[PDB]
Design an enzyme around this catalytic site. Structure first.
Site, PDB file in Angstrom:
ATOM      1  N   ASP A   1      26.089  50.731  -5.292  1.00 52.56           N
ATOM      2  CA  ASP A   1      25.867  50.417  -3.872  1.00 52.56           C
ATOM      3  C   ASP A   1      24.828  49.335  -3.653  1.00 52.56           C
ATOM      4  OD1 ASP A   1      25.577  50.376  -1.157  1.00 52.56           O
ATOM      5  OD2 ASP A   1      25.240  52.542  -0.933  1.00 52.56           O
ATOM      6  N   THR A   2      25.268  48.081  -3.459  1.00 55.64           N
ATOM      7  CA  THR A   2      24.260  47.032  -3.271  1.00 55.64           C
ATOM      8  C   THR A   2      23.489  47.153  -1.965  1.00 55.64           C
ATOM      9  OG1 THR A   2      25.977  45.584  -2.332  1.00 55.64           O
ATOM     10  CG2 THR A   2      25.572  45.436  -4.679  1.00 55.64           C
ATOM     11  N   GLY A   3      23.959  47.943  -1.021  1.00 54.46           N
ATOM     12  CA  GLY A   3      23.371  48.218   0.272  1.00 54.46           C
ATOM     13  C   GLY A   3      22.385  49.392   0.225  1.00 54.46           C
TER      14      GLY A   3
HETATM   15  C1  LIG Z   1       8.360  55.506   2.004  1.00 54.36           C
HETATM   16  C2  LIG Z   1       9.833  55.608   1.636  1.00 54.36           C
HETATM   17  C3  LIG Z   1      10.773  54.826   2.527  1.00 54.36           C
HETATM   18  C4  LIG Z   1      12.032  54.273   1.865  1.00 54.36           C
HETATM   19  C5  LIG Z   1      13.316  54.498   2.650  1.00 54.36           C
HETATM   20  N1  LIG Z   1      14.409  53.589   2.317  1.00 54.36           N
HETATM   21  C6  LIG Z   1      15.578  53.686   2.964  1.00 54.36           C
HETATM   22  O1  LIG Z   1      15.715  54.599   3.784  1.00 54.36           O
HETATM   23  C7  LIG Z   1      16.651  52.657   2.641  1.00 54.36           C
HETATM   24  C8  LIG Z   1      16.523  51.438   3.527  1.00 54.36           C
HETATM   25  N2  LIG Z   1      18.013  53.190   2.824  1.00 54.36           N
HETATM   26  C9  LIG Z   1      19.064  52.630   2.219  1.00 54.36           C
HETATM   27  O2  LIG Z   1      18.952  51.639   1.502  1.00 54.36           O
HETATM   28  C10 LIG Z   1      20.369  53.410   2.343  1.00 54.36           C
HETATM   29  C11 LIG Z   1      20.593  54.280   1.099  1.00 54.36           C
HETATM   30  C12 LIG Z   1      19.547  55.349   0.781  1.00 54.36           C
HETATM   31  C13 LIG Z   1      18.326  54.881   0.004  1.00 54.36           C
HETATM   32  O3  LIG Z   1      18.495  53.780  -0.578  1.00 54.36           O
HETATM   33  O4  LIG Z   1      17.207  55.437   0.009  1.00 54.36           O
HETATM   34  N3  LIG Z   1      21.492  52.497   2.534  1.00 54.36           N
HETATM   35  C14 LIG Z   1      22.564  52.906   3.201  1.00 54.36           C
HETATM   36  O5  LIG Z   1      22.593  54.090   3.618  1.00 54.36           O
HETATM   37  C15 LIG Z   1      23.626  51.825   3.353  1.00 54.36           C
HETATM   38  C16 LIG Z   1      23.555  51.016   4.655  1.00 54.36           C
HETATM   39  C17 LIG Z   1      22.151  50.860   5.187  1.00 54.36           C
HETATM   40  C18 LIG Z   1      21.322  49.944   4.574  1.00 54.36           C
HETATM   41  C19 LIG Z   1      20.022  49.750   4.988  1.00 54.36           C
HETATM   42  C20 LIG Z   1      19.561  50.513   6.058  1.00 54.36           C
HETATM   43  C21 LIG Z   1      20.410  51.424   6.674  1.00 54.36           C
HETATM   44  C22 LIG Z   1      21.704  51.612   6.251  1.00 54.36           C
HETATM   45  N4  LIG Z   1      24.962  52.392   3.297  1.00 54.36           N
HETATM   46  C23 LIG Z   1      25.340  53.040   2.079  1.00 54.36           C
HETATM   47  C24 LIG Z   1      26.412  54.085   2.385  1.00 54.36           C
HETATM   48  C25 LIG Z   1      26.778  54.846   1.108  1.00 54.36           C
HETATM   49  C26 LIG Z   1      27.581  56.114   1.516  1.00 54.36           C
HETATM   50  C27 LIG Z   1      28.909  56.065   0.804  1.00 54.36           C
HETATM   51  C28 LIG Z   1      26.728  57.335   1.271  1.00 54.36           C
HETATM   52  N5  LIG Z   1      27.569  53.517   3.049  1.00 54.36           N
HETATM   53  C29 LIG Z   1      27.850  53.877   4.292  1.00 54.36           C
HETATM   54  O6  LIG Z   1      27.096  54.610   4.945  1.00 54.36           O
HETATM   55  C30 LIG Z   1      29.150  53.379   4.912  1.00 54.36           C
HETATM   56  N6  LIG Z   1      30.062  54.507   4.982  1.00 54.36           N
HETATM   57  C31 LIG Z   1      31.264  54.485   4.459  1.00 54.36           C
HETATM   58  O7  LIG Z   1      31.656  53.532   3.799  1.00 54.36           O
HETATM   59  C32 LIG Z   1      32.129  55.705   4.709  1.00 54.36           C
HETATM   60  N7  LIG Z   1      33.469  55.333   5.125  1.00 54.36           N
HETATM   61  C33 LIG Z   1      32.198  56.572   3.444  1.00 54.36           C
HETATM   62  C34 LIG Z   1      32.731  57.985   3.704  1.00 54.36           C
HETATM   63  C35 LIG Z   1      31.815  58.991   3.029  1.00 54.36           C
HETATM   64  N8  LIG Z   1      31.947  60.372   3.394  1.00 54.36           N
HETATM   65  C36 LIG Z   1      32.395  60.983   4.482  1.00 54.36           C
HETATM   66  N9  LIG Z   1      32.864  60.336   5.546  1.00 54.36           N
HETATM   67  N10 LIG Z   1      32.385  62.321   4.503  1.00 54.36           N
HETATM   68  C37 LIG Z   1      28.928  52.799   6.318  1.00 54.36           C
HETATM   69  C38 LIG Z   1      27.951  51.634   6.320  1.00 54.36           C
HETATM   70  C39 LIG Z   1      30.257  52.372   6.923  1.00 54.36           C
HETATM   71  C40 LIG Z   1      12.949  54.324   4.128  1.00 54.36           C
HETATM   72  N11 LIG Z   1      12.550  55.496   4.897  1.00 54.36           N
HETATM   73  O8  LIG Z   1      13.005  53.181   4.609  1.00 54.36           O
END
Ligand SMILES: CCCC[C@H](NC(=O)[C@H](C)NC(=O)[C@H](CCC(=O)O)NC(=O)[C@H](Cc1ccccc1)NC[C@H](CC(C)C)NC(=O)[C@@H](NC(=O)[C@@H](N)CCCNC(N)=[NH2+])C(C)C)C(N)=O
Ligand SMILES: [Cl-]
Ligand SMILES: [Cl-]
Ligand code: NA
Lengths: 99, 99
Positions: free
Chosen positions: B25-27
């Site tokens: 997951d590059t996102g």
């Molecule tokens: C001090 C600590 C803090 C660090 C912490 N960091 C984060 O929260 C960071 C930014 N989050 C992320 O990077 C998260 C992943 C979790 C993680 O990495 O920790 N990324 C994500 O969640 C990214 C998009 C995103 C990016 C940045 C911000 C917000 C959202 N999407 C990844 C996600 C994977 C999914 C299959 C579980 N994809 C999706 O959510 C996509 N969904 C889909 O593709 C669905 N159709 C899949 C179906 C799955 N199941 C179901 N329906 N029952 C959607 C965009 C259409 C914070 N609080 O900022």
């Protein structure tokens, strides 16, 4: 181009006449953009991911420019925290993951 | 290898001697896996995604194999809908996005 993943893979897109920043997300099936107006008809959809689901509007056959590459496809519009380019358009620009 | 995105980029991973499926997951900034037992201490983290925030358990310096490539790094454990390999471990296996 080759994008390394040390940082978020953010690019400029052009959609509905507007320049936006968006994240290239191989973990996204679909493309979802923050609230904006798009032309044509739409239908409601729910999409889920971490944290649960959000309601979006589904617009089909929308043209988009992604980092200089034109593509057409379905674009979802709704309260996403970040603009996301998902697989439905990443394919059209020939994007691959390599290691 | 080179992975196109017409289907979900699912790979096999090995963690704690067990094989699991995960999505490249590059996102995703971070790697998140479904509830499982991991050794050592953990620390609290909140992570957000498309539908809001979840609490996870953060484990550091965990050995994990991804598509045959060895990594040692941070793994978050919590109520994710799917196991995801994020940029923290994609960089360890030398992954890049190309178009
Ligand atoms: C001090 C600590 C803090 C660090 C912490 N960091 C984060 O929260 C960071 C930014 N989050 C992320 O990077 C998260 C992943 C979790 C993680 O990495 O920790 N990324 C994500 O969640 C990214 C998009 C995103 C990016 C940045 C911000 C917000 C959202 N999407 C990844 C996600 C994977 C999914 C299959 C579980 N994809 C999706 O959510 C996509 N969904 C889909 O593709 C669905 N159709 C899949 C179906 C799955 N199941 C179901 N329906 N029952 C959607 C965009 C259409 C914070 N609080 O900022
Ligand atoms: Cl599409
Ligand atoms: Cl192809
Ligand atoms: Na349309």
């Amino acid at each position: 181009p080759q994008i390394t993943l040390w940082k978020r893979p953010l690019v400029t897109i052009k959609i509905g006449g507007q320049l936006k920043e968006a994240l290239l997300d191989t973990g996204a099936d679909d493309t979802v953009i923050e609230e904006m107006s798009l032309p044509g008809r739409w239908k409601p959809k729910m999409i889920g991911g971490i944290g649960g689901f959000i309601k979006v509007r589904q617009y089909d056959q929308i043209i988009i420019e992604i980092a200089g590459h034109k593509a057409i496809g379905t674009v979802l519009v709704g309260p996403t925290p970040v603009n996301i380019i998902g697989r439905n358009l990443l394919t059209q620009i020939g994007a691959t993951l390599n290691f």
